[PDB]
Amino acid sequence: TKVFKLSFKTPVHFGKKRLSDGEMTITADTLFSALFIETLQLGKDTDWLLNDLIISDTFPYENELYYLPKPLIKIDSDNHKAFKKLKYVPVHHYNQYLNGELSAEDATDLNDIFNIGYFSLQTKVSLIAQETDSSADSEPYSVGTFTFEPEAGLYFIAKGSEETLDHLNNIMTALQYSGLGGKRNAGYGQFEYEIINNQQLSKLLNQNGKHSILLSTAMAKKEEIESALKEARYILTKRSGFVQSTNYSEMLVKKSDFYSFSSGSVFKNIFNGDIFNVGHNGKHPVYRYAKPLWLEV
RNA sequence: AUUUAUAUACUUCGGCUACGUGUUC
């Protein structure tokens, strides 16, 4: 169980609905998708890295401090205002939060100190139209990009057998030169990675409790969802989009809509996910990653 | 052969990125 540190140094576009939307972190779906496409391009085998590996979502970090998503636990006060405005809780204070030891003023201070990047829109045009030869409008369009301070970035949580971890490290060595976002070929999204161990993160990841904090985007398989939702606090997130090299027409190929729990849901009955298939009318199967990575407290 | 040694005034005034055009198939 290692973590992988990511520093960017170039703006990255991550996207929700259009190109001119900017987003800070990315989900396990696009992460596994990038790993899988990099593997296929490299020509190695996918069986090893399909049904053994567990990937957690990407989360941001700052100078020396790491972050995790806000648990969706019922804190019984009544402000319900400063906490709603909080999105990430530093690791130093995680167990303090889950025991209701976080004060309103401390929450305000954390919100004040949480600057880890800013948003930008760069305007771009496209003269590929008749403009080159005849009177034709240049078509302006915008892309949403997000940048980090020189001491920031994203990090991973990965776990599995050591052989799978070695394969993952190889693939990431390959991948640091492809992208991890949107307009990869337009100049966005190259990174350097580094493997680090953290004593505090390790203790947090190997705790023992009664609840569970979901750190990835997963969906229970058909026969286990019924028992999964006995006592659950969760939010669903729709995940759609097109696919890369499935048929002749990109604009005719579009993945089937899929729904999965978010990255902060709390469950009482642990379930195992699966790599659901979201293909139809296609030559090769298309995958989406739904497999949980729990922390028990 | 015996005293000046450039002197006062003014040291730039007047008149202050327009159009195709932003988004999608």
Side-chain angles (χ1 to χ4, degrees), chain A residues 13 22 68 70 76 95 100 118 140 174 206 226 230:
Chain A
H13 157 68
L68 294 174
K70 164 159 177 210
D76 287 341
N95 288 356
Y118 63 92
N206 289 337
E226 293 177 350
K230 284 322 310 303

Short mmCIF file of all heavy atoms in Angstrom, two decimals, chain A residues 13 22 68 70 76 95 100 118 140 174 206 226 230:
data_model
loop_
_atom_site.label_atom_id
_atom_site.label_comp_id
_atom_site.label_asym_id
_atom_site.label_seq_id
_atom_site.Cartn_x
_atom_site.Cartn_y
_atom_site.Cartn_z
N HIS A 13 -6.68 20.71 -17.41
CA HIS A 13 -8.11 20.82 -17.61
C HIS A 13 -8.74 19.46 -17.33
O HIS A 13 -8.32 18.46 -17.91
CB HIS A 13 -8.45 21.26 -19.03
CG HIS A 13 -9.82 20.88 -19.45
ND1 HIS A 13 -10.95 21.45 -18.90
CD2 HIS A 13 -10.26 20.00 -20.37
CE1 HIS A 13 -12.02 20.92 -19.46
NE2 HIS A 13 -11.63 20.04 -20.36
N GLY A 22 -13.68 23.99 -15.29
CA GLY A 22 -12.43 23.65 -14.63
C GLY A 22 -12.68 22.97 -13.30
O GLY A 22 -13.55 23.39 -12.53
N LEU A 68 -8.12 15.04 2.68
CA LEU A 68 -9.08 13.97 2.41
C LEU A 68 -10.46 14.59 2.27
O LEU A 68 -10.70 15.70 2.75
CB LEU A 68 -9.09 12.92 3.53
CG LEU A 68 -7.83 12.09 3.70
CD1 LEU A 68 -7.97 11.21 4.92
CD2 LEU A 68 -7.60 11.24 2.47
N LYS A 70 -14.43 15.37 2.85
CA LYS A 70 -15.23 15.55 4.05
C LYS A 70 -16.17 14.36 4.24
O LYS A 70 -16.97 14.08 3.35
CB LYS A 70 -16.03 16.84 3.94
CG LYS A 70 -17.16 16.96 4.93
CD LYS A 70 -17.56 18.41 5.13
CE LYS A 70 -18.74 18.54 6.06
NZ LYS A 70 -19.57 19.73 5.73
N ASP A 76 -24.27 16.35 15.26
CA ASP A 76 -25.47 16.82 15.94
C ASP A 76 -25.13 18.07 16.74
O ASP A 76 -24.48 18.00 17.78
CB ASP A 76 -26.05 15.73 16.85
CG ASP A 76 -26.71 14.62 16.07
OD1 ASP A 76 -27.05 14.84 14.89
OD2 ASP A 76 -26.90 13.52 16.63
N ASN A 95 -9.35 12.51 12.56
CA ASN A 95 -9.99 11.83 13.67
C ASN A 95 -10.63 12.82 14.63
O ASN A 95 -11.63 12.50 15.28
CB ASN A 95 -8.99 10.95 14.41
CG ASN A 95 -8.60 9.73 13.61
OD1 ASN A 95 -9.14 9.49 12.53
ND2 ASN A 95 -7.66 8.95 14.13
N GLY A 100 -16.16 14.87 16.38
CA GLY A 100 -16.83 16.12 16.69
C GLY A 100 -16.02 17.08 17.52
O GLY A 100 -16.58 17.81 18.34
N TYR A 118 -5.83 28.06 -8.16
CA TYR A 118 -6.80 29.01 -8.67
C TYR A 118 -7.24 28.58 -10.06
O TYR A 118 -6.64 27.72 -10.69
CB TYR A 118 -6.24 30.42 -8.67
CG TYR A 118 -5.05 30.62 -9.59
CD1 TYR A 118 -5.22 31.03 -10.90
CD2 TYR A 118 -3.76 30.41 -9.13
CE1 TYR A 118 -4.14 31.22 -11.74
CE2 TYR A 118 -2.67 30.59 -9.96
CZ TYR A 118 -2.87 31.00 -11.26
OH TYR A 118 -1.79 31.18 -12.10
N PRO A 140 -14.23 31.70 -31.71
CA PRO A 140 -13.59 31.68 -30.39
C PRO A 140 -14.21 30.61 -29.51
O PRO A 140 -15.41 30.33 -29.58
CB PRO A 140 -13.87 33.08 -29.84
CG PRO A 140 -14.37 33.88 -30.99
CD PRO A 140 -15.04 32.91 -31.89
N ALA A 174 5.59 5.28 -17.40
CA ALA A 174 5.21 5.55 -18.78
C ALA A 174 4.24 6.73 -18.87
O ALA A 174 4.35 7.57 -19.77
CB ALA A 174 4.59 4.31 -19.41
N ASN A 206 -4.88 2.18 8.35
CA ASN A 206 -5.00 0.89 9.01
C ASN A 206 -5.66 0.99 10.39
O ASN A 206 -5.33 0.22 11.29
CB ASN A 206 -3.64 0.20 9.10
CG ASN A 206 -3.13 -0.29 7.76
OD1 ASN A 206 -3.89 -0.52 6.83
ND2 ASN A 206 -1.81 -0.46 7.66
N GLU A 226 -28.74 -4.51 -2.25
CA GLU A 226 -29.88 -4.52 -1.34
C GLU A 226 -29.42 -4.49 0.11
O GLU A 226 -29.96 -3.75 0.93
CB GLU A 226 -30.75 -5.75 -1.60
CG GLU A 226 -31.45 -5.74 -2.95
CD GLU A 226 -32.25 -7.00 -3.21
OE1 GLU A 226 -32.12 -7.97 -2.44
OE2 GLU A 226 -33.02 -7.02 -4.20
N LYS A 230 -28.41 -0.56 3.91
CA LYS A 230 -29.15 -0.67 5.15
C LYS A 230 -29.13 0.64 5.92
O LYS A 230 -30.18 1.14 6.34
CB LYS A 230 -28.59 -1.81 6.01
CG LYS A 230 -28.96 -3.23 5.56
CD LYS A 230 -30.38 -3.44 5.02
CE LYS A 230 -31.48 -2.87 5.93
NZ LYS A 230 -31.42 -3.44 7.31
#
